[PDB]
Design a protein around this ligand. Structure first.
Ligand SMILES: Nc1ncnc2c1ncn2[C@@H]1O[C@H](COP(=O)(O)OP(=O)(O)O)[C@@H](O)[C@H]1O
Ligand SMILES: [Mg+2]
Ligand SMILES: [Mg+2]
Lengths: 66, 132, 50, 49, 41, 122, 131, 227, 50
């Protein structure tokens, strides 16, 4: 909980466990930490621009306990 | 009845059990009187996300008031949020966490099949990654 | 004799309590009186054939 | 400091009653974020018009 | 027993009728109107 | 509670705010009278209930149901004056999703005008 | 396509019929309402269930102007008349002539609607001051 | 109405007051007219709303009522046993060790429409005596819930034929004292005793201890009429 | 039942209690600091007055 904006991607052929790796990361992190899954095609909305949707997901990604 | 002071929400629990003999086929249900004093206070640790309290004042979901209902019905479509609202949200959240009332838990954003993205989204994500 | 009489008074006051609580339960609040001395309309539906 | 019998006692409590003695299922209601931003710019707007 | 077109009854309470059948009284009032009733005579 | 209406007495106070009701309802085995509150009277009066009718009443909802006029082509209801049954409400997951999206979203179940329900709802 | 039974015409007279109360009571009890109807070439008086009284009360029927009632469903519809049209100096109430023929009437009404009309009417709202 | 009652659950995660009113511009200070705001609010209040019930259901949600029976392992078995016992015209005494359990039972008992009463250490002596006297007679009152200490000692309950041990209290002496408060002299019917123990839990182990001490007395007491 | 239990305990129930007690300690320390600073201000004002 120190860094911010770190960006990694996992690259490989089909049927190699990339989505499985992401799901395992999410499940190991725990239900406390928010985790937003998405596909590339969701960013093409109808009523708002693509960048606004991406920023909405960015804001949705982090959480606050009060 | 059951009133909540923080939000003004009102819910009628139902007819009191005392008047349980007024009609042989009375449709209204009956409930015993609540226990304890009329005024109670509770402490909760409910979680939230930044987008949640951003859209909270971006567009409302008020409740039982007719004026609030018609106001939330006036605009049915979502819209782009100005950066000023985000900055005010950041200031409020910073004040809250400084006051020792809340804590911040960063999350993860997973994007499968990034090859579907186009050049403009890639450029904007490039710009937005270098944020704080 | 006095103590046996006292036990008998305990019995009579417990049956007094029983009848008191029975009367309290049966008293209820069936006294709305939604009539008053005003003009009232009555409608009935029946099928008589003698 | 020290705590060894309270473990068994509250374990007994959980086995006995179960979903209480700490919390119940609550009445869900929204968060009441209350600082707002309308009053901040109300003065500026009134000065402008 | 299923004759005729059913039977229903109506009544007025309590034991007093200030001016004719009160239902027929208000029927007569709305026949022409309050001012028309006043000017009828 | 289902049966054939035997009697109904109704008292309206003109220029009064409260009304007094009573009815007598029977089955082939039972026959009992009830007295009604406030909303029962209006519920019974919006759909004309007469003495030759067969009526079923749900206590929870107070819904009128007319099964037919016995006389004045349906056999008299039999058995106990009251009964219990089970009803199943089946709905699509998409409909539940649409209902909780917005206050007006219920109308979108028929007009088909709903746009981009937020992910947190699902 | 469907049929309707109608009693429409000009009111001759209307009167409740007092009768013995079915139960113990001390007051007038109306068991029928007699309504007389006259139209071109026809006239007829009818005895009706007294409970329909409110239908007159809500309809402001008056006497001798107009009337048009359905047979089985009950209720009454108030459709003044040319008989008293010129009687008043001036009035903002419309007048209709005497209905033609026998008071009792059989009417067959047929209409056509496309399914798209049903769908668009079901989806679209209607009413007055609702939100 | 039934569907909208059953399938409307979710509520907003965060709401901000002074924003619903500010959306329409109808507040204490706004650019609209002082009296023009009054006409519209009066009109809106006169306007009826057919969607009000959805508004109430989407603002505050209650956590059902039946789940209290569902969410405890012992409560389901207790309800089944109580229904079976009541259908056969029996009466029961329930014993427990924690006062916080009693009210937990009470709102449960009121949920099933049972006739019952209670006796613990916070009851006045005269009230205690009249309560036990009333329970000794009568039959409509079905179950009597007693604290294992205030009511666990010498008491002349006879009417109930069943004893329920909701929880166990360490040594078995108090358990035997509790379970003999029904079948002492005047019990004209067989007394059935049930004890609620959760499998694969700590409770079982505790129960184990008790039983040993029980048979302890069975190899100690040999007095009586000497030969 | 190991994995779901481990996950929910990673969320945990006592974690909320620890968070609440941390918040309580924080606001108690803030109140204590306010009390101490107000007492110091009162003492310095009193010493200045005399
Ligand atoms: N190490 C592994 N152990 C078990 N199953 C695996 C492993 N790696 C991949 N899989 C399986 O292979 C399938 C493909 O994984 P996924 O990441 O969803 O797509 P892809 O690997 O094509 O990106 C998944 O259903 C997953 O169950
Ligand atoms: Mg894959
Ligand atoms: Mg003794």
């Amino acid at each position: 909980k120190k860094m911010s904006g770190r960006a990694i991607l996992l690259a490989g052929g089909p049927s190699t466990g990339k989505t499985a790796l992401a799901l395992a990361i999410s499940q190991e992190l725990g239900p406390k930490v928010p985790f937003c899954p998405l596909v590339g095609s969701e960013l093409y909305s109808v009523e708002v621009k693509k960048t606004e949707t991406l920023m909405e997901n960015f804001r949705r990604a982090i959480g606050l306990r009060i | 009845i059951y009133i909540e002071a923080n939000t003004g929400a009102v819910k009628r629990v139902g007819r009191s059990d005392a008047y349980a003999t007024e009609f042989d086929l009375e449709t209204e249900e009956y409930v015993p009187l609540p226990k304890g004093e009329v005024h109670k206070k509770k402490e909760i640790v409910q979680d939230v996300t930044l987008h949640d309290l951003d859209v909270a004042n971006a567009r409302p979901q008020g409740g039982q008031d007719v004026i609030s209902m018609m106001g939330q019905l006036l605009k049915p479509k979502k819209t782009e949020i100005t950066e000023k609202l985000r900055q005010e949200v950041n200031k409020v959240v910073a004040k809250y966490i400084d006051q020792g009332v809340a804590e911040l838990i960063p999350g993860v954003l997973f994007i499968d099949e990034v090859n579907m993205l186009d050049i403009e989204i890639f450029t904007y994500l490039n710009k937005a990654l270098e944020s704080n | 004799k006095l103590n046996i009489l006292s036990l008998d008074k305990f019995k009579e006051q417990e049956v007094w309590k029983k009848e008191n609580r029975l009367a309290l339960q049966k008293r209820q609040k069936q006294k709305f009186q939604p009539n008053e001395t005003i003009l009232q309309f009555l409608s009935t539906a029946w099928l008589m054939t003698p | 400091n020290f705590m060894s019998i309270v473990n068994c006692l509250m374990q007994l409590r959980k086995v006995c009653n179960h979903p209480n003695l700490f919390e119940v299922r609550p009445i869900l209601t929204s968060f009441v974020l209350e600082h707002c931003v309308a009053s901040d710019y109300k003065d500026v707007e009134r000065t402008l018009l | 027993e299923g004759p005729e077109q059913l039977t229903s009854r109506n009544f007025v309470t309590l034991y007093d009728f200030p001016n004719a059948p009160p239902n027929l009284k208000d029927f007569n009032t709305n026949l022409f109107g309050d001012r028309w009733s006043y000017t009828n005579g | 509670i289902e049966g054939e209406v035997v009697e109904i007495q109704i008292d309206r106070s003109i220029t009064g705010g409260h009304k007094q009701g009573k009815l007598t309802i029977k089955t082939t085995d039972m026959e009992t009278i009830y007295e009604l509150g406030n909303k029962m009277i209006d519920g019974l009066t919006k759909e004309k209930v007469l003495a030759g009718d067969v009526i079923s009443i749900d206590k929870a909802s107070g819904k009128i149901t007319k099964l037919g006029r016995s006389f004045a082509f349906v056999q008299c209801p039999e058995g106990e004056l009251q009964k219990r049954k089970t009803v199943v409400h089946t709905v699509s997951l998409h409909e539940i999703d649409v209902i909780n999206s917005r206050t007006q979203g219920f109308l979108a179940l028929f007009t088909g005008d709903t746009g981009e329900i937020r992910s947190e709802v699902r | 396509k469907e049929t309707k039974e109608v009693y429409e015409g000009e009111v001759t007279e209307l009167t409740p019929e007092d009768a013995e109360n079915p139960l113990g009571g001390y007051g007038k009890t109306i068991s029928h309402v007699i309504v007389g109807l006259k139209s071109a070439k026809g006239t007829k008086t009818l005895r009706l269930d007294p409970t329909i009284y409110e239908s007159i009360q809500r309809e402001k029927v008056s006497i001798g102007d107009v009337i048009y009632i359905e047979a089985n469903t009950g209720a009454v519809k108030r459709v003044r008349s040319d008989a008293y049209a010129t009687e008043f100096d001036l009035e903002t109430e419309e007048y209709v002539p005497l209905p033609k023929g026998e008071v009792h009437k059989k009417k067959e009404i047929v209409q056509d609607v496309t399914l798209h009309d049903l769908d668009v009417a079901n989806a679209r709202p209607q009413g007055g001051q609702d939100v | 109405r039934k569907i909208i009652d059953t399938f409307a659950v979710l509520t907003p995660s965060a709401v901000s007051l002074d924003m619903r009113k500010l959306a329409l511009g109808l507040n204490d200070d706004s650019s609209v007219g002082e009296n023009t705001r009054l006409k519209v609010m009066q009109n809106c209040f006169e306007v009826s709303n057919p969607l009000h019930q959805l508004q109430t259901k989407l603002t505050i949600a209650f956590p059902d009522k039946s789940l209290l029976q569902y969410d405890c392992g012992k409560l389901q078995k207790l309800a089944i046993l109580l229904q079976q016992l009541k259908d056969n015209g029996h009466r029961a005494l329930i014993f427990t060790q924690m006062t916080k359990v009693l009210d937990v039972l009470e709102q449960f008992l009121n949920y099933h429409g049972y006739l019952y009463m209670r006796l613990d250490g916070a009851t006045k002596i005269e009230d205690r005596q009249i309560l036990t006297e009333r329970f000794n007679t009568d039959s409509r009152i079905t179950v009597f819930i007693l604290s294992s200490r205030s009511g666990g000692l010498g008491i002349n309950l006879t009417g109930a034929d069943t004893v329920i041990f909701y929880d166990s209290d360490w040594n078995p002496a108090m358990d035997k004292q509790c379970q003999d408060r029904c079948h002492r002299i005047g019990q004209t019917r067989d007394v059935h005793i049930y004890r609620f123990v959760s499998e694969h839990t700590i409770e079982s182990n505790i129960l184990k201890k008790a039983n040993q001490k029980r048979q302890l007395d069975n190899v100690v007491i040999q007095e009586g009429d000497f030969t | 039942l190991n994995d779901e239990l481990v996950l929910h305990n990673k969320d945990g129930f006592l974690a909320r209690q620890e968070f609440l007690q941390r918040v309580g300690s924080a606001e108690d320390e803030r109140y204590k600091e306010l009390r101490r600073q107000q007492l110091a201000q009162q003492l310095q004002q009193d010493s200045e007055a005399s």
